[PDB]
Amino acid sequence: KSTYRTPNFDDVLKENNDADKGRSYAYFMVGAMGLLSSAGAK
Amino acid sequence: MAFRKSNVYLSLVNSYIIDSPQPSSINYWWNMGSLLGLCLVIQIVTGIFMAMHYS
Amino acid sequence: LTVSARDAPTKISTLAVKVHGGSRYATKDGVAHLLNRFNFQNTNTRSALKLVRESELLGGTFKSTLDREYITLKATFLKDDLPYYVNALADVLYKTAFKPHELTESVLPAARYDYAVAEQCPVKSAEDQLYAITFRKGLGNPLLYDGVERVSLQDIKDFADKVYTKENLEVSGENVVEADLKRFVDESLLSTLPAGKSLVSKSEPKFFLGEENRVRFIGDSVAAIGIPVNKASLAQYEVLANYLTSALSELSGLISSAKLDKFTDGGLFTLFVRDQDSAVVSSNIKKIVADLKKGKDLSPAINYTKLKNAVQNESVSSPIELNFDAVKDFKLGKFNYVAVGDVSNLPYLDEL
Amino acid sequence: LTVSARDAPTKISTLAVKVHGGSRYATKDGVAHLLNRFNFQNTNTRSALKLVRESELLGGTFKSTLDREYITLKATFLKDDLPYYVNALADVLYKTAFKPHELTESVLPAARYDYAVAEQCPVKSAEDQLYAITFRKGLGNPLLYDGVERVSLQDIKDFADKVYTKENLEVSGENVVEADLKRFVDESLLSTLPAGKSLVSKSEPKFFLGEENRVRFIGDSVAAIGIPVNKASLAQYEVLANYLTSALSELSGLISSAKLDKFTDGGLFTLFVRDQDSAVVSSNIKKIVADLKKGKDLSPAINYTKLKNAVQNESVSSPIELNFDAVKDFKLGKFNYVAVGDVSNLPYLDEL
Amino acid sequence: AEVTQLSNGIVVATEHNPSAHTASVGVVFGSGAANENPYNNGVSNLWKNIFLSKENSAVAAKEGLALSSNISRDFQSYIVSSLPGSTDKSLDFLNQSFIQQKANLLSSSNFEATKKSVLKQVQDFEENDHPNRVLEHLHSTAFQNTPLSLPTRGTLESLENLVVADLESFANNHFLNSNAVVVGTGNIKHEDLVNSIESKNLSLQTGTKPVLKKKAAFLGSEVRLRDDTLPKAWISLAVEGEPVNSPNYFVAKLAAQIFGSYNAFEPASRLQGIKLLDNIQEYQLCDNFNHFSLSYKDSGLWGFSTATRNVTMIDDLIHFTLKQWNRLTISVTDTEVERAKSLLKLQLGQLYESGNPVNDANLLGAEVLIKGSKLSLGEAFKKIDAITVKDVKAWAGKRLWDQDIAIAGTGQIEGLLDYMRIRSDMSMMRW
Amino acid sequence: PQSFTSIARIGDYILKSPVLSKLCVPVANQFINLAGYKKLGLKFDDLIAEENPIMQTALRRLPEDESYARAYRIIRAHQTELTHHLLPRNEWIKAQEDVPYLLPYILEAEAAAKEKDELDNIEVSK
Amino acid sequence: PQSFTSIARIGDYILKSPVLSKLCVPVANQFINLAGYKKLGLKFDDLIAEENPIMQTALRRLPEDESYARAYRIIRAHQTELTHHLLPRNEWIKAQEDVPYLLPYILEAEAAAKEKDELDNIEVSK
Ligand code: HEC
Ligand SMILES: COc1c(O)c(C)c(C/C=C(\C)CC/C=C(\C)CC/C=C(/C)CC/C=C(\C)CC/C=C(\C)CCC=C(C)C)c(O)c1OC
Ligand SMILES: CCCCCCCCCCCCCCC(=O)O[C@H](COC(=O)CCCCCCCCCCCC)COP(=O)(O)O
Numbered sequence A: 001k002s003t004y005r006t007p008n009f010d011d012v013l014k015e016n017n018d019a020d021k022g023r024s025y026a027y028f029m030v031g032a033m034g035l036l037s038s039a040g041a042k
Numbered sequence B: 001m002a003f004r005k006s007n008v009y010l011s012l013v014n015s016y017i018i019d020s021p022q023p024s025s026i027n028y029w030w031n032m033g034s035l036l037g038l039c040l041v042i043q044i045v046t047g048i049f050m051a052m053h054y055s
Numbered sequence C, D: 001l002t003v004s005a006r007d008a009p010t011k012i013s014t015l016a017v018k019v020h021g022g023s024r025y026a027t028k029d030g031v032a033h034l035l036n037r038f039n040f041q042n043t044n045t046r047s048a049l050k051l052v053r054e055s056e057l058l059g060g061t062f063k064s065t066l067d068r069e070y071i072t073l074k075a076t077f078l079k080d081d082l083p084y085y086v087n088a089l090a091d092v093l094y095k096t097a098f099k100p101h102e103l104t105e106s107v108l109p110a111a112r113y114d115y116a117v118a119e120q121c122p123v124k125s126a127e128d129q130l131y132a133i134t135f136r137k138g139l140g141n142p143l144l145y146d147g148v149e150r151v152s153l154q155d156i157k158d159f160a161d162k163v164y165t166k167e168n169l170e171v172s173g174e175n176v177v178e179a180d181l182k183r184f185v186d187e188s189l190l191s192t193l194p195a196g197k198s199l200v201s202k203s204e205p206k207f208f209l210g211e212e213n214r215v216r217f218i219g220d221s222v223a224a225i226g227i228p229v230n231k232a233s234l235a236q237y238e239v240l241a242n243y244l245t246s247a248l249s250e251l252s253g254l255i256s257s258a259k260l261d262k263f264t265d266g267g268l269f270t271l272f273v274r275d276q277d278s279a280v281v282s283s284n285i286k287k288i289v290a291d292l293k294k295g296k297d298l299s300p301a302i303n304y305t306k307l308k309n310a311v312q313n314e315s316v317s318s319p320i321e322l323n324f325d326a327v328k329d330f331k332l333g334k335f336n337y338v339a340v341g342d343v344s345n346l347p348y349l350d351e352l
Numbered sequence E: 001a002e003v004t005q006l007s008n009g010i011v012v013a014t015e016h017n018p019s020a021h022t023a024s025v026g027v028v029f030g031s032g033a034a035n036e037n038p039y040n041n042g043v044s045n046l047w048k049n050i051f052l053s054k055e056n057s058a059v060a061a062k063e064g065l066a067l068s069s070n071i072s073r074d075f076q077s078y079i080v081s082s083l084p085g086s087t088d089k090s091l092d093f094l095n096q097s098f099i100q101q102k103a104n105l106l107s108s109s110n111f112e113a114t115k116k117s118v119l120k121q122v123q124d125f126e127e128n129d130h131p132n133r134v135l136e137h138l139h140s141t142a143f144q145n146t147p148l149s150l151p152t153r154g155t156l157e158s159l160e161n162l163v164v165a166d167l168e169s170f171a172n173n174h175f176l177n178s179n180a181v182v183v184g185t186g187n188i189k190h191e192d193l194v195n196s197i198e199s200k201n202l203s204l205q206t207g208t209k210p211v212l213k214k215k216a217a218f219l220g221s222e223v224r225l226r227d228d229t230l231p232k233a234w235i236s237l238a239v240e241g242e243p244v245n246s247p248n249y250f251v252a253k254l255a256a257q258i259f260g261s262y263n264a265f266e267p268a269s270r271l272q273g274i275k276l277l278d279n280i281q282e283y284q285l286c287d288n289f290n291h292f293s294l295s296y297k298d299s300g301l302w303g304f305s306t307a308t309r310n311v312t313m314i315d316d317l318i319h320f321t322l323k324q325w326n327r328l329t330i331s332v333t334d335t336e337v338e339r340a341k342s343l344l345k346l347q348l349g350q351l352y353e354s355g356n357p358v359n360d361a362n363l364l365g366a367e368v369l370i371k372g373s374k375l376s377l378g379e380a381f382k383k384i385d386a387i388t389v390k391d392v393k394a395w396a397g398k399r400l401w402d403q404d405i406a407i408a409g410t411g412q413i414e415g416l417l418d419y420m421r422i423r424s425d426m427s428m429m430r431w
Numbered sequence F, G: 001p002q003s004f005t006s007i008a009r010i011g012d013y014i015l016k017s018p019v020l021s022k023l024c025v026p027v028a029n030q031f032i033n034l035a036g037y038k039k040l041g042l043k044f045d046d047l048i049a050e051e052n053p054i055m056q057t058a059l060r061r062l063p064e065d066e067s068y069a070r071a072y073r074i075i076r077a078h079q080t081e082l083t084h085h086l087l088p089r090n091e092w093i094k095a096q097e098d099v100p101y102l103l104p105y106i107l108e109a110e111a112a113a114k115e116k117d118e119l120d121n122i123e124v125s126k
């Protein structure tokens, strides 16, 4: 098996990448954690 | 080099809690050390703010 | 001061200053290489940093290459920017600084890297050995500085005063209007160089035959033969080189490289056989020498060599073209042999 | 198995095993040097550490030296301790271990250090070039391992099976009672070696004349000449070497070293001219070659050479002594020239 | 200069340079390495080397004709160079080489010798040419499970399974009429080439190359070919670039030109007008780098490849390089844009207007295959002059600022850190 | 801190006796396949702790190909333990592949260090 | 942090004027021999602090023999200050030996760094 044949990631990849959707969802969740951390630190 | 590597104070912060090479197979039992550090900070800060009222 | 340039609607022009100051004119070993890596350093007026910044903002780069005969200063740039590059090359030929710290910091490590690169390649080492055993004092000087002879900063200044003269340089332009180039040269600092003498000797160099040199080396074993040429027997060796390179020959898969270095008064035909295994090099070089001493017919390779001479001739100072219509036959006479690699298993000159 | 020893009331005895396995018998380049730095490592029975500890507690040290013809194992020790050292040398000749880690850890860095030492000395390099251009396949093998030819651990085991045989070694003793040494050898493991063949060829080696080799080097420039000898013309070159060394000659301040390497069937007369300045080496070697081609009279140096041959002959295998009473005259014939150093300023063989 | 173009099913596009002394004539197909499944991979390399085979090159060299070939991701080419009086000979040879017959090139002995030679060349590429195999793995992991990931050179495990039937199947599916452009560059006229093609027949095939089911899509990933027995650490790193026929083509190339290329051993290369050099020259972080803006038919790549011996400070190299990349979005100056304009005019005019006719033939064939006509260099210089700082900032915000990256590395890359710190360094947290 | 000569002596005394071998070799390989280091794709010589200079010596002694194989087995074990899964049954180390490959290098380093210590503390034969 | 071009400009403006030179050159060398760095066996270019990269550059620029002499003057100054004595009057640095030997190396490094900063912050001639 060559080193150019990438193994199977297809069970764990997104069916649609759409690089603003995924980054917006991730930054929304990180921002929610930062929101509640700011409230708790206050 | 980077400022976190060339500064005298931030080199310790770097080599301890930023770029410290950890083994990539350690589970949650290798987390009690950080947890003890947090709980020691809790004990000290509550001890000061409660020993301002203690005779 | 020979100025020549051709014109074309191509939007990028190049300017070249060919000066006869290569390794065959070196006073000590590798002085020409120190002068080559020294030019385009700081001058008396602008620093090298200001040179690189203003040439990069105007849109042109710099290159200084040495050969076995020339020291070529080249500048490739956009067509409107001509007098800046003519004045820059005039300032480099006239008034470079020659500060000692420049030698100890930017010039000598570059020369160390150039020699380390060409020592790791065995065919360059074999080519230098072949030159050194064929033209032992003249052309056979080493091309690169290795440090077996102490070259001071005064030696480099004396060599640059020897070589950069008005009678020693040709200004060649590509995509440049010629009369405007002649006006910019006659207005610049290039016209006030000291008018020394042309170093080009017209006589044929004294060449030696039947010599042999053997250099031990770790890596690829290479066996090489070398034939000094005349001025009249040069086209036969040109069509020989392009015969052995192409697929017309039954032994092009046996050799690795074969080229003819054309000079103004002669040159050297080289022929390199390179392989990591010494028995393969041995069998190949014995077969090559036996088949060349058997004789070849160079008639089928003549149009192919006209083509390869056309694709190589781009410079203004191209040698004599029409000599190809008279070559017919070749038989291997006497030659000079080097052997770089696993020396204890390569063949000797007596058994070839 | 030739055993010979002489006796004296001196309280320290030495024991030597001379085996004809030097660099002239090497299968690949530098295998004999790997066998030399490999012996007195771990055996099958005692380790090398236990060997050094017990020999140091008993009072004797070990030494293994290679030459161009021999592999000599020497042991210097106190006289009462003879059978321990006879059994130790028998175990080293018979059953060394040849483990791969020993090669990669203790044997190869020692060989790297030996080659780095003798590469920093230019006259050893010039001597190896002189041997390699005079006896190109036989004696002319390199003495040291430089790594241009891959030598595996199986190569060293095959070479040690080739060389260490009963017909190939001489046991020499100094300050040792002879019959007791013959009894200890006949009782040890040295009598059960495989009885192979004597590698000493009786014919004269094929020698080459008029050759030349040039090696660039940073440091002291050295020019060297070399003359292959016969078996009968050997005393003339011995008295020549001791003539040029002593103050009897008008040019002993010009040369640096001059020696004759006596072998069983011939040898090489070397003559080294060493100086840091290349013009000094040039003038000296031209004067030396001109004066030797003019001719010399070797009659005054004959008692001096009898003395110097007496102080050099200490070994049992000393060559033929009485040849000195017939030498009269010398005139320089054909020779072989190397030049190591600032090669572009040293003289060539055609102009000597 | 001028580029003309005509059609009859084939496309004839020329560049009459009357000052040149040779004339290259050849066919440039529109198939490439991106039109192979991963089991016949390397069949284009094998067509390159049976066209450059010994018997074929000998028959070419009898008339004074030098052969040339090129295998890219998008386009193949088969160029025959000759003297300017032998364009008819070159056309008739190319006709006899491809069109009139292929069985004499595809004999048993010629095919087995060529398969042996290409297997040797692919193995020699795989274990000795390190920055190029880093760039090939960068393509193989940026575009993975997608036909633009396949290397042009082929793989050892696939190329030893090819037989003559696969060569002929690829020839029947991809060496077609509409797929091809016959190109003549150098010292030939356009009318002479068209009249000489119409003098012969030169009809390649019926037409219609197979259409790929999956389009190219960038996929942020990494691959680490760690080999501790190598003296250096080669590493490429790239984002999704701009394809051709994009309005941000010259802007992507000028963004690559801003940070340029570098060689730490050349003295005139250490004095360039890049602000990355002030950070990179202090502790000697790398030996060389180059910023590339690769543009393919479907997608593209924008990034840098580098090599270094300072294997303990690779993360500082990546760190300062990516902070300089983040300067494009926020605060790239006017002087850097003017400098990149001048240098990109320079290298683009060196690329399109060099003296070598075979490179002109490759470039013209690729461009008139993709976008139907060749954009001449004066309009290219006008498009470079039209770029402002706001265009570069908008492009960097679209393509650079906090986008996925693809990393490939080999050698002593243990000093290279995880994917996440390199990914998180694409946005500064200070803006 | 078992000093491999000692464990080798005890194990050879068990193996050379028929009764003890017949008694506690089934207990032995039952202990092995209940230990479950096979299921992470490891061998037992991959499992000996190597942070003492004698085992570090025996790892320098090791040939190249076995060293690269050992490095791959360690990295696949760390990755499988990280994902908290096990390797699939086709990728488990079988019983025949669990070869004591590093044991002779370790034993010769043991004998070398033991001999060095003995000779470093000798008396003299008076 | 004086930027030697600036002090050189002020000093040359004082020296080239006759009135200012006649006024404050006696004050100048009176200040020098009241400073007393001569009495420890030092020169003033031996006294400039060298822990910034431009002065470190100008010390790399320096020839070998002057570097060894500067190293000896520093070590004799440390030893004389350690013994809390002064050097004897024959060993004091005289007025003619107090040569500004390192000043041109420092000034060319100043001009190089100034030119690098200017070219690093240029506009374009539109
Ligand atoms: C002033 C600093 C201070 C520090 C630091 C501190 N404490 Fe205390 N601690 C107190 C005071 C005051 C009290 C008594 C008041 C109370 O018990 O509420 C106390 C009480 C306690 C008690 C008894 C609590 C109860 O009410 O029964 C425990 C248990 C204790 N500390 C443990 C710890 C430990 C464990 C640590 C840290 C390792 C620690 N303390 C650090 C101040 C401190
Ligand atoms: C192996 O990998 C590692 C690892 O390398 C490290 C370093 C850590 C991290 C270890 C720690 C964080 C532990 C560090 C703990 C300390 C340094 C203890 C210090 C504790 C303190 C409380 C500091 C003392 C400070 C004070 C007392 C200030 C308080 C003063 C107050 C509140 C004054 C209030 C008065 C007024 C008027 C405001 C890991 O967790 C870890 O596993 C992942
Ligand atoms: C001395 C006391 C020791 C206590 C042990 C605490 C161990 C964990 C500390 C967590 C620090 C998180 C910082 C991460 C970070 O800055 O990543 C920064 C940004 O990440 C974030 O913004 C995290 C969101 C905000 C989380 C705030 C948590 C505050 C609650 C802390 C409660 C314990 C004090 C870098 O992230 P990036 O490199 O992936 O881009």
Ligand SMILES: CCCCCCCCCCCCCCCCCC(=O)O[C@H](COC(=O)CCCCCC)COP(=O)(O)OCCN
Residues within 6 Å of the ligand: B006, B007, B008, B009, B010, B012, B013
């Ligand atoms: C017993 C140990 C107890 C813990 C002590 C060790 C751990 C200390 C961790 C400290 C982390 C926070 C320090 C970060 C501050 C970095 C700023 C800095 O270094 O800049 C310093 C200046 O710092 C200061 O002026 C005062 C710092 C006092 C710090 C008070 C907390 C400049 O440093 P530098 O010389 O590298 O900069 C050159 C400019 N390019």
